[PDB]
Amino acid sequence: QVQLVQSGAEVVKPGASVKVSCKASGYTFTSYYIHWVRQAPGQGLEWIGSIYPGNVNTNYAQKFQGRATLTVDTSISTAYMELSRLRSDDTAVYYCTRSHYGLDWNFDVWGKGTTVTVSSSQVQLVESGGGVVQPGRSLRLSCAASGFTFTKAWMHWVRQAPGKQLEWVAQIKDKSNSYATYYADSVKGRFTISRDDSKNTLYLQMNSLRAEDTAVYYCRGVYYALSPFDYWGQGTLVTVSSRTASTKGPSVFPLAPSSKGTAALGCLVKDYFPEPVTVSWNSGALTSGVHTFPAVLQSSGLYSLSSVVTVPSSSLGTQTYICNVNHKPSNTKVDKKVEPKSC
Amino acid sequence: QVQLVQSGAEVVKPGASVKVSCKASGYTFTSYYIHWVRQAPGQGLEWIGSIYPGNVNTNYAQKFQGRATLTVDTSISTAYMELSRLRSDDTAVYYCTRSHYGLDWNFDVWGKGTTVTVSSSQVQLVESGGGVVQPGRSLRLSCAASGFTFTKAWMHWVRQAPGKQLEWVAQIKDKSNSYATYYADSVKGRFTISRDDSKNTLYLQMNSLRAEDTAVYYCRGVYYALSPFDYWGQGTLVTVSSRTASTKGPSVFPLAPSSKGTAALGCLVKDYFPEPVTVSWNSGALTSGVHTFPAVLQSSGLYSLSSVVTVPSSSLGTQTYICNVNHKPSNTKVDKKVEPKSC
Amino acid sequence: KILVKQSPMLVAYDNAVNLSCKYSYNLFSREFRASLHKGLDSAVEVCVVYGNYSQQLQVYSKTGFNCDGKLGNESVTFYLQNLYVNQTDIYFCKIEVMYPPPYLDNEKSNGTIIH
Amino acid sequence: KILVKQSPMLVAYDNAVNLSCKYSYNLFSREFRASLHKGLDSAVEVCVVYGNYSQQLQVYSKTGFNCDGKLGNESVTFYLQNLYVNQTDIYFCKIEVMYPPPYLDNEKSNGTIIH
Amino acid sequence: DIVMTQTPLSLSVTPGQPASISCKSSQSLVHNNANTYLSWYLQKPGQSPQSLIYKVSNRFSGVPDRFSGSGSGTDFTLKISRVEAEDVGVYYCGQGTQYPFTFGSGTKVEIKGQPKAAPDIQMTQSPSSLSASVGDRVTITCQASQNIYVWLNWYQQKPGKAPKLLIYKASNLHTGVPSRFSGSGSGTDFTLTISSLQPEDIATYYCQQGQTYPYTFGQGTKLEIKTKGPSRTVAAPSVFIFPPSDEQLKSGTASVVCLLNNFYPREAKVQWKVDNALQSGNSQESVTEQDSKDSTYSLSSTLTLSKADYEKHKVYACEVTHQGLSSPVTKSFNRGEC
Amino acid sequence: DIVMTQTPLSLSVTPGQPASISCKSSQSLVHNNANTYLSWYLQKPGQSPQSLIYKVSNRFSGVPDRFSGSGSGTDFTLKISRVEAEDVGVYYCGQGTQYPFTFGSGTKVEIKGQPKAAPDIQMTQSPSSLSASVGDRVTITCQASQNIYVWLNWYQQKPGKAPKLLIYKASNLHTGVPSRFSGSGSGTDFTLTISSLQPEDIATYYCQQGQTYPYTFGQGTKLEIKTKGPSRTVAAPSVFIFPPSDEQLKSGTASVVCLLNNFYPREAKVQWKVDNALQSGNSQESVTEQDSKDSTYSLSSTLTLSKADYEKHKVYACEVTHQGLSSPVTKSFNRGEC
Ligand SMILES: *[C@@H]1O[C@H](CO)[C@@H](O[C@@H]2O[C@H](CO)[C@@H](O)[C@H](O)[C@H]2NC(C)=O)[C@H](O)[C@H]1NC(C)=O
Ligand SMILES: *[C@@H]1O[C@H](CO)[C@@H](O[C@@H]2O[C@H](CO)[C@@H](O)[C@H](O)[C@H]2NC(C)=O)[C@H](O)[C@H]1NC(C)=O
Ligand SMILES: *[C@@H]1O[C@H](CO)[C@@H](O)[C@H](O)[C@H]1NC(C)=O
Ligand SMILES: *[C@@H]1O[C@H](CO)[C@@H](O)[C@H](O)[C@H]1NC(C)=O
């Protein structure tokens, strides 16, 4: 019965603090220099501080002072940990571990750990698209609003050239103001910003690309009413230079299905180069029993692959089946429906 | 008006303390490091300590710490000195002197000094006689009791041989106990202790001297009633050895007086050797107008002198005139009356 | 309380000197920690000593200094060796009683100086 | 109150080093005493400095040490020279404001060490 | 057309020290609606912008009281009392009143050296994961970049449970752990000697350092178990054959597939028998990696040829063979018809 | 016959440290009156005994509570809590019950070194008193035994009044004192230069030291004024003549005196004229020193001779001459008669 009773499954948003408990018994609670150790999933353990009522003077870690706050209480033999301003990278499995008497070099008995997960207070403005594109050609971006009330926001697009300041490009107004559109003049006629209120999503088309366009692109959401906010995006990397890299996008072909009580079907993507192509199924909702086969090099120097799936042979008229192939080096996306041959 | 008002004529017994006052004005009393300086008559000045409310920490003199105690008070700008356990050698003229601001090296303005005299709480048992004496011969000592009630005391004589312990010799009892006499056995028959209650004086005769008698002699007074005390003496030095030093004591001769309205008379001490003889007048009560003439060396190798005095020619039948000659090297005392020739 | 007394100067001739802290409590048969450091900002910890009832004077180091374990009646002794010229700095003594709670420490034990 | 800050170490190369106490009060135009000693038992007093409104930085010594007078805005500087090997000891700073009474001193100003 | 002059362009002051940036305007940011659409932002180095101050004197909810806006007309000042790690990075200001909007030049901010941390400690453990059999002598090392005389601590931690201290020294048997968990080291770099690897040793091992603060063992030597399949039993495959698309026939090429599915082991044999005339030289084999759940592989065979020669024959099959198959299955089809 | 064994025979302990002496007896000091006549004394080194403890547990009034007696029968212990300077010195104990009494052997007590005082300072000033005329250049020195760089202070102090600081440095004119009070010194021993001695400088001069505590200038250079008589006017003498005693005539010798009294100046002339036959070769002259009050001398002349030659003549006189005497007085007498 020499252990450390740890607190329960506690989960909250980023930035807010958390109060943890660690009840000690079976030994001298008033000694042994209680610790705290969090386990960031992906690598090993961690350390923050040691605690003793006698030496509550400052002995913590560098980017920990001011954030963590250790306490104890002899009357019920309990220790508490309280991490504040919890960033997203603070999500880990927290332990309270006990050093030996008067010293700190070995950890005697470890607490049973704690569930401490933090993620995505709101799913902020998350951008998409971008990458390698020759000048003069086109490209379209994206921005997925979630966690908040999109339809009423004032949406912008603000870019940051490498090492430069922030450059406002275009803002679109919410649905009440006739979907008002305003551009910076460097994109007058070239670009066009847009949105689908039905989809919590903001779009911006980029045409007649020049090198001045070489900049990160941040998606912006603005509100100035009795509950105001200005929400930035994540940033999507968009660069312009004249790299030939002669590349062709895949042709896509349907593996027509038939009967047998289990069936199968797939999509065939042929003659594509370079590597790789990404294949999603039903726009991200079909994963169970899917095998996307590894790229195979053909004699022609061109790659090729196929992706298949097992579903019941019953629903083949009922459920609708569509494969997605996005090949951003060639900057070509293709979708195809797979329905049995009308024989 | 930049001065130090000192206290008045304060006089008390030894051992008791004394509180002195020194009022400061005309400047910043709360600075300048007040001091105290006592003037022992016979040599120069003295020093005890400096005082400041800010540094009341211990900065005094060696045989002064614990005895002196300096204080101040800002509300009336006064300084106080309080010497305790006042020994007889503490009698002096006390001053309060002021150092310059923030420093102590010069004394700026001296207080007007204080009358501080101490002497003889009681005139303790004071011994007399003693000195050079060949062995086997006699000698008589003395002890003058004053300041206390002698007639009821238990009187002893305790000697201290050189570097040795204290040796009780003889005690005599007070007047109630039949003047009881008790001797140590080494003096049984030799010595005899005695007293005159009328004279507050204790006597001890020393006969058949031997070298064992070589010791200081302390006069003792004892009482064990509802107000008890044991009073020691001062100590008189008595040594025995066989130093010949062939010496003769003076013959004394009267300068017979006559008329003229002023008269004179003296005593002639002739043929004495070695030096000197002491001549007192009327057993210590006649000093005004007395000239004791310096020793004159005679042809015979022997010294001689005369001592004279001027008194009115009126009282020559009335007042009685007697000279005293004590010559302790020869251990001979002689007294002579000087009355005009009955012509 | 606890009080501490140690030398005001100790010139370590030929990298050899003895440092002792005169401690004030009962004879023995308790648990304790008697630490030694270097700096008032707690720049260095040089040695620290404890002993159980039977277990003898356990002794180790945390900045690799050389330390031996010596204990008497109610006084500690540090057998420090392998000195240098630069780490010449002030040296202080520390104490912490555990039973009973709470702990009423000493003022900053004056310390010592070495050469 | 008053607070004091000074170096934690100053190796006096070739018997030459500068010692300064960072003092905390108003600019100037008061009366003061900024003392320097050697030992925590007040074994030695090495120098002490005061300056009147017009009168410049008066400076002297009481154990015959060498001291120059240097004053800035609210900081003192000691130009100490003629060092030795044995008197190498800790050095502390002292302060005493006079107006107004009473005096709420500093804790023992940490001090400095020399070589 | 209304450019923002951030004043100054950079600064830094020790933690606790204050600061001040001033956004001076070209024109008046007061709008014909009697509002000022100024703003203050912070771009942490390497991250997206995040907003701080909505109108002028107006702090976004979730921002600590350490920030504060101020100003009016064309004079605008931003102050910060205590600068910590969360406050380092560039600051901008922007008008939102007259089109087109503008941002400041960027007020780069960081902290000038607080206590000389003397960078803490570095603990290297190899590997991140090995594959050692049961019983093999495994001895994992532990290296540091500084001189820790002796402060190692070995924490057996199966992924999921609380860390279990194995040895409370460089090499000293901690109680509760068998006598085979021994260690060794002569000098700067110590080690741990597991004599025999056992099934309960399937864990992620750790070594601690203990000489100076701070502390990060935080590496992980995840000892994963070794078997390709033996602990995963026989799984006969599920065999399907796909003809080409009428889309590709009209393009000249004609691909055919013989998809196997969910078999263990990896060993498989496929043979395209066109017209029972065993063909050879047209097929590429592609196989997946062992599944996360069932530890089974799944395989495809892509026979390919031209329309011209495809329209010649009619029967297309692929005799699949396997261990889990009692007999070679022969899935087939005929051309054109269904 | 009842000897006292003091136990021990010596001791010493730092100030504040306790002590204990034990007086062990030969016989029982309890008297047939049911009292014990023991006592405890202290002999300070170089002084007479002083009593402390009257019966056994009984302290004499005026003794501090630091002393205390104890015991009974033949066991007797004396204890002292804090030993100071007043307590150093030998201790004895004595019985007062059975004759003859006895004392202890002596318990020598002092103090073992308290703080190393590093003996304070020594200030030598010469002379204790000089006799310098008015206006003479007087420069009194001041020597020390240690190295005081500059800490002298000159205190003019006429005997009787408060000390007056003359110079608040080695040589720096203190304000309130004329520009003639200058000093000088090059090195270890400084001095003071009074250019002209004046009547108000009749004082006892002092020099102070000011480098380390303690402090004692305490010497005194008493500048006393010089004149034998000039400021003491003429005083004619008073002349008396004494014949011998009839006691000494019957012893063979016959002394005669010519006593002068209370004259200034010292200059005097005496001539014994026996029978107006001026004698010469028998008289010794003896004179006193200048009186404390009137500054006058007083002189005797002792003519001497034998009975045999004394009974020859009848007239004996001594012509005294002086300045204050308008004419030589001739006091005389005749033999036998009156
Ligand atoms: C002497 O140095 C010590 C460092 O060991 C100082 O301790 C702390 O200093 C910070 C400021 O740097 C203060 O905020 C703390 O309150 C101090 N702690 C204590 C316990 O005082 C110390 O301040 C320095 N001396 C003085 C007199 O301040
Ligand atoms: C450090 O040394 C100082 C001496 O400068 C000590 O100061 C005094 O010491 C005596 C005993 O020797 C005590 O009676 C006093 O109370 C001490 N004074 C003060 C102000 O504390 C000091 O005691 C020593 N350090 C400690 C912690 O006691
Ligand atoms: C002491 O420090 C100095 C730095 O100035 C360095 O050069 C010297 O080597 C150090 N002493 C030793 C013994 O390394
Ligand atoms: C330092 O003290 C020692 C005492 O051991 C002495 O011998 C030496 O001479 C002193 N140093 C100097 C420079 O006098």
Tab-separated table of C-alpha atoms in Angstrom, chain B residues 37 39 42-48 58-63 65 67 85 89 95 97 100 104-113 124 154 156 158 160 163-168 171 173 182-185 218 220 223-224 228-235 252-257 260 262-266 268 270-271 289 291-299 304 306 308-310 336-337 341-343, chain F residues 3-4 36-39 41 43 47-51 53-55 60-61 64 66 84-86 92 99-106 117 151-153 155 157 160-165 167-169 174 206 208-210 213-220 239-248 251 253 255 257 259-262 284-289 291 296-300 302 304 331 336-338:
chain	number	residue	atom	x	y	z
B	37	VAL	CA	35.624	61.428	29.590
B	39	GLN	CA	39.626	63.071	34.777
B	42	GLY	CA	47.041	62.865	39.385
B	43	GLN	CA	47.258	62.136	35.660
B	44	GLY	CA	45.388	63.159	32.524
B	45	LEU	CA	41.955	62.347	31.156
B	46	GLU	CA	40.310	59.022	30.219
B	47	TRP	CA	37.861	57.352	27.820
B	48	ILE	CA	35.048	54.840	28.238
B	58	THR	CA	29.282	46.851	21.975
B	59	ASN	CA	32.108	49.388	21.483
B	60	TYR	CA	33.578	50.194	24.931
B	61	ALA	CA	36.929	49.823	26.723
B	62	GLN	CA	38.363	46.616	28.178
B	63	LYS	CA	37.846	47.003	31.930
B	65	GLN	CA	32.285	46.707	29.673
B	67	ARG	CA	30.278	48.714	34.381
B	85	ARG	CA	30.426	49.035	41.210
B	89	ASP	CA	40.120	54.413	42.100
B	95	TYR	CA	32.925	65.134	31.227
B	97	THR	CA	32.350	65.599	25.051
B	100	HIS	CA	32.041	65.844	14.960
B	104	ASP	CA	34.777	60.425	16.288
B	105	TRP	CA	38.359	61.644	15.898
B	106	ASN	CA	38.062	65.189	17.304
B	107	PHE	CA	36.093	66.368	20.329
B	108	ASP	CA	34.042	69.444	19.474
B	109	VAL	CA	32.492	70.908	22.642
B	110	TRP	CA	33.240	69.605	26.122
B	111	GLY	CA	30.714	69.433	28.916
B	112	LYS	CA	31.328	71.582	31.964
B	113	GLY	CA	32.536	68.536	33.955
B	124	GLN	CA	38.245	50.277	57.529
B	154	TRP	CA	35.203	40.035	67.697
B	156	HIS	CA	41.373	38.838	65.340
B	158	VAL	CA	45.415	36.882	60.779
B	160	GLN	CA	49.785	35.884	55.500
B	163	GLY	CA	53.128	33.453	48.932
B	164	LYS	CA	51.629	31.200	51.623
B	165	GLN	CA	48.066	30.792	52.888
B	166	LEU	CA	46.364	32.799	55.645
B	167	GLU	CA	47.379	31.893	59.209
B	168	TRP	CA	45.125	32.726	62.149
B	171	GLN	CA	41.468	36.631	68.351
B	173	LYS	CA	36.470	38.934	72.078
B	182	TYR	CA	42.778	33.159	72.446
B	183	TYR	CA	46.116	32.574	70.709
B	184	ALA	CA	47.500	30.250	68.125
B	185	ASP	CA	50.060	28.057	69.825
B	218	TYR	CA	45.722	41.724	58.662
B	220	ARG	CA	40.033	41.389	61.539
B	223	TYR	CA	30.091	39.913	64.230
B	224	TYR	CA	27.476	37.143	63.963
B	228	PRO	CA	26.672	40.263	60.866
B	229	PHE	CA	29.942	41.176	59.202
B	230	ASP	CA	33.572	40.114	58.945
B	231	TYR	CA	35.807	43.129	58.303
B	232	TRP	CA	39.414	42.655	57.256
B	233	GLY	CA	42.166	45.222	57.662
B	234	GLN	CA	44.590	46.748	55.193
B	235	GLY	CA	47.738	44.752	55.974
B	252	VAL	CA	65.213	65.439	71.653
B	253	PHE	CA	65.630	68.892	73.193
B	254	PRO	CA	63.141	71.703	73.889
B	255	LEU	CA	63.488	75.165	72.362
B	256	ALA	CA	62.322	76.961	75.506
B	257	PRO	CA	60.060	79.929	74.602
B	260	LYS	CA	57.987	88.425	71.765
B	262	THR	CA	53.957	86.858	68.758
B	263	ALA	CA	56.140	84.050	70.096
B	264	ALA	CA	57.823	80.879	68.881
B	265	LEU	CA	59.085	77.519	70.097
B	266	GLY	CA	60.402	74.272	68.701
B	268	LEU	CA	65.565	69.944	68.658
B	270	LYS	CA	70.091	65.785	67.569
B	271	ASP	CA	72.594	63.055	66.693
B	289	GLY	CA	52.548	78.135	60.914
B	291	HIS	CA	58.201	74.844	59.734
B	292	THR	CA	60.023	71.519	60.040
B	293	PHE	CA	63.545	72.308	58.908
B	294	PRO	CA	65.408	70.104	56.410
B	295	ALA	CA	67.861	67.534	57.711
B	296	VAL	CA	71.366	68.933	58.168
B	297	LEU	CA	74.438	66.705	58.073
B	298	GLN	CA	76.799	67.231	61.003
B	299	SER	CA	80.566	66.741	61.009
B	304	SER	CA	70.242	66.594	62.958
B	306	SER	CA	64.897	71.228	64.366
B	308	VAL	CA	59.563	75.249	65.154
B	309	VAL	CA	56.187	77.018	65.166
B	310	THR	CA	54.670	80.502	65.597
B	336	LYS	CA	58.461	66.352	74.472
B	337	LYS	CA	56.555	69.274	76.017
B	341	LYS	CA	61.484	78.519	81.470
B	342	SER	CA	60.197	78.992	84.999
B	343	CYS	CA	62.663	81.819	85.627
F	3	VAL	CA	42.879	21.702	58.499
F	4	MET	CA	40.910	22.738	55.414
F	36	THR	CA	28.677	25.835	61.352
F	37	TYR	CA	31.334	28.556	61.383
F	38	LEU	CA	32.606	28.132	57.826
F	39	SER	CA	33.441	31.051	55.539
F	41	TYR	CA	36.888	34.664	51.076
F	43	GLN	CA	41.995	37.649	47.932
F	47	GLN	CA	45.196	43.266	47.969
F	48	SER	CA	43.874	42.390	51.398
F	49	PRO	CA	41.256	39.673	51.937
F	50	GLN	CA	37.567	40.526	51.757
F	51	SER	CA	34.855	38.261	53.130
F	53	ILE	CA	30.087	34.021	52.870
F	54	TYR	CA	29.314	34.244	56.577
F	55	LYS	CA	28.075	30.930	57.865
F	60	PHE	CA	27.659	39.102	53.033
F	61	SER	CA	25.609	42.156	52.082
F	64	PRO	CA	26.521	40.039	44.016
F	66	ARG	CA	26.921	35.353	41.432
F	84	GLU	CA	34.517	38.683	35.605
F	85	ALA	CA	37.547	40.825	36.427
F	86	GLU	CA	36.301	41.462	39.982
F	92	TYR	CA	40.125	30.596	50.754
F	99	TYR	CA	40.363	26.637	68.195
F	100	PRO	CA	42.735	27.246	66.645
F	101	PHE	CA	41.055	28.288	63.397
F	102	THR	CA	42.337	27.355	59.949
F	103	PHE	CA	42.273	28.599	56.357
F	104	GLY	CA	42.404	26.799	53.036
F	105	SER	CA	45.508	26.416	50.901
F	106	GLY	CA	44.314	29.002	48.381
F	117	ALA	CA	42.536	42.693	22.884
F	151	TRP	CA	45.051	60.846	14.421
F	152	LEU	CA	46.398	63.475	16.832
F	153	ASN	CA	44.217	65.940	18.758
F	155	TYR	CA	43.482	69.671	23.935
F	157	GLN	CA	43.155	72.204	29.275
F	160	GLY	CA	40.227	73.138	36.298
F	161	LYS	CA	38.240	73.985	33.162
F	162	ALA	CA	36.794	71.817	30.401
F	163	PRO	CA	39.232	70.554	27.742
F	164	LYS	CA	39.507	72.835	24.713
F	165	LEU	CA	40.388	71.225	21.389
F	167	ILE	CA	43.807	71.333	16.523
F	168	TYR	CA	41.546	68.682	14.960
F	169	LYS	CA	44.321	66.839	13.063
F	174	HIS	CA	41.007	74.316	14.781
F	206	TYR	CA	47.177	66.863	25.867
F	208	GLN	CA	44.861	62.383	21.526
F	209	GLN	CA	45.124	59.289	19.347
F	210	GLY	CA	42.216	58.181	17.213
F	213	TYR	CA	39.668	51.393	20.323
F	214	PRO	CA	40.401	51.750	23.309
F	215	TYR	CA	41.611	55.314	23.908
F	216	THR	CA	43.770	56.929	26.608
F	217	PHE	CA	45.577	60.228	26.177
F	218	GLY	CA	45.599	60.609	29.955
F	219	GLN	CA	49.142	61.947	30.426
F	220	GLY	CA	49.275	65.701	31.085
F	239	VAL	CA	63.672	86.936	63.913
F	240	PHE	CA	63.853	84.757	67.037
F	241	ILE	CA	66.786	83.408	69.067
F	242	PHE	CA	66.712	80.273	71.232
F	243	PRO	CA	69.260	79.444	73.932
F	244	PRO	CA	70.130	75.816	74.724
F	245	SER	CA	68.143	73.648	77.120
F	246	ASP	CA	69.344	73.109	80.669
F	247	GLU	CA	68.830	69.466	79.656
F	248	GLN	CA	71.635	69.635	77.090
F	251	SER	CA	74.906	66.533	78.639
F	253	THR	CA	76.746	70.035	74.280
F	255	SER	CA	73.093	74.247	70.822
F	257	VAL	CA	69.485	78.768	67.184
F	259	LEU	CA	65.413	81.228	63.616
F	260	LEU	CA	64.342	83.506	60.773
F	261	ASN	CA	60.745	83.325	59.618
F	262	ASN	CA	58.624	84.203	56.583
F	284	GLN	CA	75.045	75.069	60.047
F	285	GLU	CA	72.462	76.798	57.850
F	286	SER	CA	69.166	75.106	56.996
F	287	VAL	CA	66.451	76.684	54.844
F	288	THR	CA	63.042	75.495	53.664
F	289	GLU	CA	61.527	75.608	50.197
F	291	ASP	CA	55.958	78.247	50.695
F	296	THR	CA	58.439	82.959	51.327
F	297	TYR	CA	61.417	81.065	52.708
F	298	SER	CA	62.187	80.477	56.378
F	299	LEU	CA	65.678	79.870	57.736
F	300	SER	CA	67.449	78.520	60.819
F	302	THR	CA	72.324	76.349	64.558
F	304	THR	CA	76.818	74.748	68.611
F	331	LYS	CA	68.476	89.780	68.688
F	336	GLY	CA	71.880	81.974	82.859
F	337	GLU	CA	69.549	84.867	83.594
F	338	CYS	CA	66.335	85.559	81.697
